[PDB]
Design a protein around this ligand. Structure first.
Ligand SMILES: C[C@@H](Cc1cocn1)NC(=O)c1nn(C)c2ccccc12
Ligand SMILES: [Zn+2]
Length: 140
């Protein structure tokens, strides 16, 4: 589990969105595994605006933050899970790192701020849904 709290937005994995998220919906995209809802309180996270390929992510199944090198956001075929059939996921970045299904929502960050959240994984890989292109998260 986990979310990004920037401005009056909450960014979560679409597959982990709650009824309150759907009832306060700002934007969602199944191909990216992302959903954004509105919040009453202002958040403290800031979004990175860059093309870094090194950063650190939080792994709840180890209670640890790990440094990683990761690929650029791309269209990748992801195997089936209980939340989606096997399909192409867009804006996804891969790295070598430990992960388990409940690690989704952990933040990946670089020197500039938050880069994205854990979305996919297995066999020593972890995949992150990028948010750096969502410029509107910084205003309104
Ligand atoms: C919960 C789904 C969401 C999903 C996105 O694309 C399709 N399904 N993801 C997973 O199944 C999953 N995520 N991580 C971090 C893993 C690590 C090891 C094994 C499985 C996974
Ligand atoms: Zn950066």
């Amino acid at each position: 589990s986990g979310a990004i709290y920037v401005g009056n937005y909450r960014v979560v994995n679409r597959h982990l969105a709650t009824h309150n998220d759907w009832a306060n919906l700002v934007w969602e995209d199944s191909s990216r595994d992302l959903l954004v809802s509105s919040t009453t309180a202002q958040g403290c996270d800031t979004i990175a605006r860059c093309d870094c390929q090194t950063g650190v992510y939080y792994c709840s199944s180890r209670r640890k933050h790990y440094p990683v090198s990761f690929s650029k956001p791309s269209l990748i075929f992801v195997e089936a899970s209980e939340y989606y059939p096997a399909r192409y996921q867009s804006h996804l970045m891969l790295a070598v790192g430990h992960s388990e299904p409940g690690d989704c929502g952990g933040i990946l960050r670089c020197q500039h701020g938050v880069v994205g959240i854990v979305s996919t994984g297995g066999n020593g890989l972890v995949g992150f849904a990028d948010v750096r292109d969502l410029l509107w998260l910084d205003e309104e």
